[PDB]
Every structure is written in structure tokens, then in C-alpha cells.
């Protein structure tokens, strides 16, 4: 199907196939040297150069080496600089270049490569779709939105562009507008639309506007393998971990941490109140679009397992206390933070990103009425000096209808069934 040989390369097809057979047989090192000799002898052959790049690519996989992959990325580029490169080969080479640049985190490099692909193949819709993903991966949602708008103006029923356009609209809090794009896109069944992110946000968008069909999409996301259950919808998971909305201290095994929080709760409270009174700018407004209404801010001491040194200058005794518990200070998928919430606040039903953490709440200033938290089908209240523990990968929701402020201390711990190996290896969130 793919024509990769130009006029000259057809005349050396026997040497090219001999080298490629070595690669497909798994003799990566012999294949590299074979293609290297072909590149030496035929420096202008695009197929020889692509063979070298693919062998370097395979070798980087065998050796798990970023440096070898950086070589391959350069050789895929060399292919594109040679004369008389067939169009199928040019596209294959730069597509892989971009994909491998993304694998290494060279999102700026991938973007330049994707922009070149679109310039070279201005009628290939899938490449424009890939360019939009390049922008999403660097956080440039404004340019990503423009790309999918251009795609949909030409091919209005492209499902990949629909689900990605809907994702962007929802991230901008255009909730009602996002629903038909996410739904139509998923329903298209096009490649790339059967993705847990789109079921997740479609159901959540529907929940926010009061569309009772939301749980039909959660139900179908569950049946298609994206969600462990309809209630537990996190997407960065280790399968097999015990799944319960609410946990006791003894069930977690972290009984010493809980005792320390409960015995020393007043020093934790007083440092939080001192920050409220003398350094309130350390409390930052919630910024993940999780409120329907109201005021909610957090003062973070640890995130991704890293201590915030300036923040700890505002709660030095609390930071000193917590240092004895690596189950939380080293939880690279959680945080340690104060959270203040004021009356008139409603936090939308939502889910955290990962099932690899459990979340402890210590009550610090709790009005006697008006504050409550639901996780799954059970609602609870806080108590001053007491710890609640829940799995925030389950859907949960919060209300604050008191007549004064509510302050809690939030401490994330690794899920207790994670091994030390997993705790060291999982990527941070």
C-alpha cells in the first residue's frame, strides 16, 4: 500500500530488503550497521535513511535509552531533507518523529514537526487533528480550539475533532455547548473517540445542567473499560486496589499519622488561622472549575511529594510534625493543604484523577450546622479535632451553608495496598 521507494531506491531494493529483513528478524544491531553502510554508500537514499532511523528507534526500545531515541528523532528528520522523498515515506517519517518527540516530552519540538506536516499535506484532516493534540499537550487551548474549528468547518462530522472540541469547550466552562460535541463525537465511533476522558466530561457536563442521562454515559464508560465502576471514575489507576468510598483509620493502617493529627490538631488549626489573619494571600482560590458558587481557597504545604519551603515558613510547626510521615510527604499523587470554605458554597459532584491515594480530612474550625460532604451514596460531617478518610476517586460533593467559615486540613496518603516499588515508580500527579 505505502510506496516508499523513489526511482533510485527501486534499483537498490535488494540491498534495502536485506537490511530490513535483519530488523524484522530482531537482529537490531546488525540491522543498524547494515543500514549505516547503505547510508554511507547511498547518502541520498530516503529508504536507507528511514531504515537507519527505524533501527535506532527499535534500539532505543531495547536499551530504554532517551539518548538513542534522540538520535532516531534526528535521523527521521534527515529523511525529510533528502531529495525526491515519496509522499508516503515523508509522512511516515515525520509522524514518527513527532510521536517520539512527545514520548520524550519535547512538546515544543513535536509542535514544530506537526506544523510542518500540515504545511506539507494541507488536505490531510488527521494531521490537523494531531496538530490540535500537540497544542493540548503544551497547554495552549486557544490554538487547539482554532485547529478543531478549522477541521469542523471542512468536515463537520469528524468525530475526533468533535470530542476534542467539546473537551475544550467544557474546560472553558461552556458546559451546555460542550455536550452535543462530546456526545456526537463519542457516538461517531471514529478512531480516538473511545477515550475515558470524553465519557468522564460528558457525564459531568450533563450532571451540571441537570440532565439525568449522565449516568447512562458513566454506565457505558464502565462497560467499555474506562471506569472501575460508575461511581469511581478516576483515569490514572492501578488496577486491583481495594475500592471503598469511606475508610476507617485502622483499615488504612496509618494509625500513627491519624493519632498525631488528632493529638496535635490545635497547633495545626492555630497556624492556619495565623495565616488567615496575617498572610491570607498564601490561600489561593480553587482553580479547577469545581464550584457552582461560593468561595473556597487552599494553602498548600506539599504537592507531588515536594515540600513548598516558603509555604512551610507560614506553618513551620505543622510542617515539622508531618515530616515524620513519608506516607503523606512522599505521596507524589497527592497534596497536604489547608482548605477554607465559606457559606454559600456548593462544590459540584466530581472525581479526583487517581485511585492511588486516599484523602484524610482533619476538622479545624467546623460550624455546628451547614457543612457536609457526600462521597458515593453516603454523606458525612466534620468534627473539630477528628479525621475523616475517603477515596476521592469516588464521586463526591460538598456544601457550605453555615454562618461562618469552615477550615479543614487535607492530608493525602498512598493507597495502603501499593507496594514500595509502585510508590517509587508511579509518575507524579
Amino acid at each position: 500500500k505505502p510506496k516508499l521507494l523513489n526511482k533510485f531506491d527501486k534499483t537498490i531494493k535488494a540491498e534495502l530488503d536485506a537490511a530490513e529483513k535483519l530488523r524484522k528478524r530482531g537482529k537490531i544491531e546488525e540491522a543498524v550497521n547494515a543500514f549505516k553502510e547503505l547510508v554511507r554508500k547511498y547518502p541520498q537514499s530516503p529508504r536507507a535513511r528511514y531504515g537507519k532511523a527505524q533501527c535506532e528507534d527499535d534500539l532505543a526500545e531495547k536499551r530504554r535509552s532517551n539518548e538513542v531515541l534522540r538520535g532516531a528523532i534526528e535521523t527521521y528528520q534527515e529523511v525529510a531533507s533528502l531529495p525526491d522523498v515519496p509522499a508516503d515515506l515523508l509522512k511516515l517519517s515525520l509522524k514518527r518523529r513527532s510521536d517520539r518527540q512527545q514520548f520524550l516530552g519535547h512538546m515544543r519540538g513535536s509542535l514544530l514537526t506537526l506544523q510542518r506536516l500540515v504545511q506539507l499535506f494541507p488536505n490531510d484532516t488527521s494531521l490537523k487533528n494531531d496538530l490540535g493534540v500537540g497544542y493540548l499537550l503544551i497547554g495552549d487551548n486557544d490554538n487547539a480550539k482554532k485547529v478543531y474549528e478549522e477541521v469542523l468547518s471542512v468536515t463537520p462530522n469528524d468525530g475526533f475533532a468533535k470530542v476534542h472540541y467539546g473537551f475544550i469547550l467544557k474546560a472553558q466552562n461552556k458546559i451546555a455547548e460542550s455536550i452535543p460535541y462530546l456526545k456526537e463525537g463519542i457516538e461517531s465511533g471514529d478512531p480516538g473517540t473511545d477515550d475515558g476522558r470524553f465519557y468522564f466530561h460528558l457525564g459531568d457536563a450533563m450532571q451540571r445542567v441537570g440532565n439525568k442521562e449522565a449516568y447512562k454515559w458513566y454506565e457505558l464508560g464502565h462497560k467499555r473499560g474506562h471506569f472501575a465502576s460508575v461511581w469511581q471514575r478516576s483515569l490514572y489507576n492501578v488496577n486491583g486496589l481495594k475500592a471503598q468510598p469511606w475508610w476507617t483509620p485502622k483499615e488504612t493502617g496509618y494509625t500513627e499519622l491519624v493519632k498525631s493529627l488528632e493529638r496535635n490538631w490545635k497547633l495545626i488549626r492555630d497556624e492556619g488561622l495565623a495565616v488567615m489573619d496575617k498572610a491570607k494571600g498564601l490561600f489561593l482560590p480553587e482553580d479547577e472549575n469545581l464550584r457552582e458558587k461560593g468561595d473556597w481557597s487552599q494553602f498548600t504545604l506539599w504537592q507531588q511529594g515536594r515540600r513548598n519551603e516558603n509555604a512551610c515558613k507560614g506553618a513551620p510547626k505543622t510542617c515539622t510534625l508531618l515530616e515524620k510521615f513519608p506516607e503523606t510527604t512522599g505521596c507524589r499523587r497527592g497534596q497536604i493543604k489547608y482548605s477554607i470554605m465559606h457559606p454559600g458554597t456548593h462544590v459540584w459532584p466530581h472525581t479526583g484523577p487517581t485511585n492511588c491515594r486516599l484523602r484524610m480530612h482533619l476538622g479545624l474550625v467546623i460550624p455546628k450546622e451547614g457543612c457536609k460532604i457526600r462521597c458515593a451514596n453516603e454523606t458525612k460531617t466534620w468534627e473539630e479535632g477528628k479525621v475523616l478518610i475517603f477515596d476521592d476517586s469516588f464521586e463526591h460533593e460538598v456544601w457550605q451553608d453555615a454562618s461562618s467559615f469552615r477550615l479543614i486540613f487535607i492530608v493525602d496518603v498512598w493507597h495502603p495496598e501499593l507496594t514500595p516499588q509502585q510508590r517509587r515508580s508511579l509518575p507524579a500527579i
Binding site: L136, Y236, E288, N289, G352
Partner: peptide
């Protein structure tokens, strides 16, 4: 852009190669 309490980003983990 980090996923702290929710799942709002296109991707929540970093890409750092092998």
C-alpha cells in the same frame, strides 16, 4: 496545569521519556 482535586487537564502526568 496540574490535576490536583479533579481531572480537568488533557493529560495529568508528565512526559519524560524512558
Amino acid at each position: 496545569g496540574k490535576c490536583k482535586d479533579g481531572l480537568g487537564e488533557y493529560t495529568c502526568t508528565s512526559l519524560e521519556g524512558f
